[model samples]
Target: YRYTGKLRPHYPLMPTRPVPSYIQRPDYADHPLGMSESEQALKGTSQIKLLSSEDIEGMRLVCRLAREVLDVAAGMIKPGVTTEEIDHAVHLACIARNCYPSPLNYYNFPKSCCTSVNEVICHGIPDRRPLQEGDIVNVDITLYRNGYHGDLNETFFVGEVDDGARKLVQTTYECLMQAIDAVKPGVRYRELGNIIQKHAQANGFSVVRSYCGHGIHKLMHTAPNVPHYAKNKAVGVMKSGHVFTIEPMICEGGWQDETWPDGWTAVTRDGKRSAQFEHTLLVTDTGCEILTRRLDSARPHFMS
Candidate 1:
């Protein structure tokens, strides 16, 4: 039988890195053995927290840093570079800004960032496999700084990719942007999925239903779970000062996903490619603001 794995395994992940005592860690960091009571309490609530002006400023800083770090990681993407190398680059970028890489030890995640390649839908842990040409990879980055968190991700072309792969990435990004444009102070969170799903369907793609976007601010995962499929039952109303992410994982084949034996890596069940794009956003008095928006120069060329 011909081997048909998405990517070859690089077994035995490195041990979790220790965060310096001086750095301000999230509450979950203290109780690695289990979910902290405070975290559980936060998870149970559906009331979206409205940020004060000061909180918005803190979010702006962290979100800007998140985009910067993602850009740095994206710049390093090419054939022959290992995902572990991308993780190290992201870790150093976070430390250079005195921000903590939010993924590390957050619910026992081993890496500073997430690198999902090819058929991997999301949360594919970084490994030592060198990326190959024509591959599509998603790099998810979240940074904690000044008591706030900023999260975003992008699916990129490793080298020369086919038109089908190019269109997949392009349409997935449009799905995110169109959904963001639909945001308003009084809109329901459930409506976001409708907008996202419509676009994905129009492009002949399927939205991965298992993973949804989330409200992220002081905590990595928070109130207002944002689902990306139409007719989702997610609750909450947008209001000025409310912040959340609208990341949609769109697939070229079956929307269903299955987890690998590693227990963290999620892959498309049909083995077709998946693409995702994300942005942390804030509801403003009139409209919304993209907290993790890329600079004009840094915006992905495929986005245009």
Candidate 2:
């Protein structure tokens, strides 16, 4: 099939790595197609998971670990570091904490985490390609522990990039944070699309329409399908116990996208560039707490 951009599939990926049995596995962990029977059953509903205090406590623990894993993945991004190596590091780190790399076997996703690069928008499988200088990549990490899941992703600069690249990444982060800022009780979940779409367009970028943030807790992808663009059909309202993510994938070109033959990677149709930021949040009585908020010691790897 004709591809969209310069980025090509680095096939013959390292076979799915082993996850020790002691570490808990998701429902789809061993399924032939990595299909989650639980997710399939819930497809007909838009019911958001209302987490309890005890449930949220579990989210905090896992989300903090997910943050640590993501830092490990992003910190490894420099010219010449292959994403497969980064995936190995992340898997070992998750195992050390006795957490399951949530993406493993998820919908048959091969890697433990996603490594989206350049025109590739999301679900970019970790591969053998060495991230080159001047490339921007997104590392998506999700960890499951004690019966809950925490998911988030951040784009990183592999080396020094041009103003256009830096600006897109900065604007994507801003779009995510601004949408998070609008989270509170009684807000329509789709309003996040308005917030994200406004910022993306204001900065001369487009919001990716194919992939989106999701309700993450027991199930990796669940209720309240969050659209990052404006005028979306997302349903539900944010309540004190609602837990989900509002990841906006902003593109430097058209919002349209196409998938690779590998059947997982989603890339921009025009293949200019894409950047993203994500966070798992729990709506509080008044506002929301960024469950995956970075620790003060883990300095952010943002490009100026």
Candidate 3:
């Protein structure tokens, strides 16, 4: 296969971390092929799920746990630290909360959460590469708790970065927040893409078209597909009790992407950089609530 950027996969990913019996797991957790029968059944189906108050409560709690695991990975971000270590730290954080890391074993994925660095857009598996000072990594975390899934991710600066990296990361965050601000009932789901695309393009970036946000509740991925690019053809309207993600993968170069040979990592075709932010949201009668919103400003979690 052709190469893209300086980023390379660390061959021979680590073994799957064990989940304690107390932690609830998804349908694909223990499959020999790591396939989700429910996900397969939902393929090509446009079944949008509506969560009740009780289900909303489940989402709220699980989202908080997902944020915790996300920070556990974030706190470890710095120069010379390997994402392989972050992968292990994230696994421990989930088990401590009695939660199952949602991405593990899904479609035979290797790691728990995704660590997308530099030119890699998303689904970048954790590996032995130590982050450099100028690198930015998106740590996407989803926790399966209360029999539901809470998915969210954030891009972080490795140390201090150049102007381009900072702007891309900050703009990606704004794009998500702006889209969430527009998440009220009776609005077309595709409208969110317009909000995201306009902002990213105005700031000299492109929205990745390949991977859009998804409706996530009990099954992790469901209906009401969300495309981040402009003038998209995605159907459906937002309604109360709807929960989904609005993760826009903003690219520093062209939005075209190619998956690595490992069939996991997705990187920019131009070998530039990409940034993304994600949140699991719940639509209420009036507006929406950021279920996985960040909380507190603690200095750090683990002592150095």
Candidate 4:
């Protein structure tokens, strides 16, 4: 619920103020619609420092470490648990492995990992907020170790969630897994959007167009922005040495998203629930390897 007060010249700062004539209530209208679109489809904003082939192997080590941390952190999600506690756990998990929590100082985000609860689209800071039952929470984890970074996120149900929220979380994970399964050499990056979009819509959900996946290696984000919606002009091919993510933000009500006044938090404009799942991928001669793949114990009920 907190927002950044200042605005960047090129991009609106966090804690954005809405226009005076908006028809919605001030509390809910504090954000703008589709901030990612205004930010160049969330691509090419920064030139990434690519990882060497040898560096990529080190990156994979950190990615596997991140995946294990995610599993440990997810085990702590439930009602009455504070988001800060989750952050602390994840932070400790990273440090315990001699890795640094990448988001801690990156861009002054002020959190170890993003704990976005229900109605929070993304970048929800960890605070005194205690997760409530029926809430859906997304834990975004990035790890920096051995001069490389690995990034991934997954949305989880808090306690006993309602049917809508449950479905959103379950279907969203499936959408990403299905898309990942289809990735390989000769597979077009543009096709990822079609498959993900079709799966979401068929299940009565809409993919959030604002946020797309990205290339990851030494840098946290890189080229070849991966769009999750169908028939989009996403660049890149499934060639060897490609490393990126295909996280599709799926919404229950509408496809449109709004950013909070704080500038970082993106939420559903209708106050509906949204879900996301992500894994860092390594394109190989055959297909791909899910570097940030979770353990068997971390699989959700719906995934089975």
Candidate 5:
């Protein structure tokens, strides 16, 4: 029940071990737009103005509203809950706050939030699929309000899970927090990837290189592409007032992935489980502030 400390290594080169069998070969290995280098470069040059003390009140309002949405969604998660229901809850939360679910209609995405299930990597479309027991799901939540957006996600266990899945889930959470700890003025955006890759490797897992964090604000997808894998050339440095997200998508199998025929769902090529955790951060003079932070009391504490 150990993961190799590698990032996107060749499938055949991966050390063999007893694990869940996944189907071979995937379509997304050659998928276009997996990494939007051109878009990333354009966004990297675009800077987000940090909120001033006067603007903190307004930022707080949006941050609080986003947290409330997450809390409500989290409480409603259960074994039998359909992803569409979760999306419905998320949509209502945003509408009630007079904001929009940023993902809806963005790039033709039909859902308010992304509910990625086990083996499904990311961008999973909401549907009638009821979560089965032992499944792992990632709920990516984003809300736009007052011309700013708050983005965050967490992977949850459906009902009960085996120890390997549990450990991967816990360790993926650690990888995200460790990456967050590296955020501050003078730190390069690429450094976050290095930190995340290293932590995931230490835990015997591979960090997905396809999707990374990005600059978030008025424009849902903005500049400064934040790669979660190591040794990446992510542009930009941590500057006070810079707001972005640091989300690490960790996979238990080979880092290779494929898209479902529906043109949205991304899943592990090997069919092994993957998990992720995310946080929206604002760089400050002192350090980084987590805008969509998890409540300390809501989840059980795990040590890295």
Candidate 6:
């Protein structure tokens, strides 16, 4: 019998695809067996790293490629397209650009990209389930190249979606943009959650409490863990040269979530819909720049 839950995770996720010997792997790629000496040294640090001018340029290149790959994968979203097929397309797109799909093996995540559907809040591993009409999927894409990482995601309508889903997706995008707009040199990182939480709650949605944005650069996840709820105690003040992501996962139900047995997929406890949008950002001498900004063509045309 087919699974009948509002959001049922597909099981037996395909084994982690091997990275060719020529492709450089991240420090955590081989963890549990133990991280390399270099990886060990970079661990346990909580201070956010400021990017140099050259670092910012490298990030710009990778972030652009990330947007390109996401657009390609998103174009394939529609009824009857399996999440695995989307993963394959994303892998090929990254290879075509000579970039590494950052989600492939870091900490043993089994897919090239994350495809979170409906109630799945985040980290939904791509699998064989074909998307259905009215389904909404979040394709989280990250690419590593030139010694830096770029990250972003958007929830796309698989086909025709109901008003509730469309509104959730649109509001999630607005939450991300508003939070990014609040970024600037010397702004406290905690204030970001305040803005996001207020906007999300005003729309009758809840800000996800478990996962937050983080500093990103040469590392996949780094310092200054950014929580997405108001009154959070996330430390650190933004400074010029700080680069990171502001991804807010908003739920149409309660903010609480539960993880699947696969240990990756996160879903709302009440099985209600969730939507998210992410963009890599740089705190500038003035305000901020969206490194993963969507092109006009990439914006959601399905939302009313």
TM-score of each: 0.95, 0.97, 0.96, 0.82, 0.81, 0.93
lDDT of each: 0.87, 0.91, 0.89, 0.74, 0.72, 0.86
lDDT of 6 by residue, 1-304 (tens): 2222466666676666666666666666667642344445777777889899999999999999999999898789899999988998998898888888888766668789999999899999999799999989999999988788899998999888899997899899889878988899988999999999899999999999999998898888878789989999988999999998999999988999888877778888888899998899988899998999876654553453
Give the top-scoring candidate (lDDT). Answer: 2
What is candidate 6's CA lDDT for residue 230?
Answer: 99
Clashing pairs in 1: none
Residue 183, candidate 5: C-alpha displacement in angstroms:
1.0
In model 2, what lDDT does residue 204 have? 92
- Candidate 1 has what TM-score? 0.95
Locate the minimum summed-lDDT window of 10 residues in model 2: 295-304
Please give the clash total of every predicted structure, in order.
0, 0, 0, 11, 6, 0
Over 4 Å off, model 3: 297-304
Q: Which scores greater on TM-score, model 2 or model 6?
A: 2
Overall local distance difference test of candidate 6: 0.86
lDDT tens digits, residue span 1-304, model 1: 2212556568676666666777777776667553545567776898889899999999999999999999999889999999999998998898888888888866767899999999999898998888999999999999989789999999988888999899999999989989999998999999999999898999899999999899888877888999999999998899999999999999999899888876678888888999999999999999999999887574664443
Better model by lDDT: candidate 3 vs candidate 6:
3
In model 6, which runs have C-alpha deviations exceeding 4 angstroms?
Answer: 1-4, 11-15, 32-40, 296-304
- Backbone clash pairs for candidate 6 read none
Error of 1 at 176 (Å): 0.4
Q: Which sections of candidate 4 miss by over 4 Å?
A: 1-53, 298-304
Which candidate model has the greater lDDT, 2 or 5? 2
Could you give me the TM-score of model 5 versus the true structure? 0.81
What C-alpha RMSD separates each model from the true structure?
2.1, 1.2, 2.5, 10.2, 10.9, 2.5
Q: Model 1, 58: alpha-carbon shift in Å?
A: 1.1
- In Å, residue 86's CA in model 6 sits off its true spot by 0.2
| Candidate 3: Cα lDDT at 44 | 76
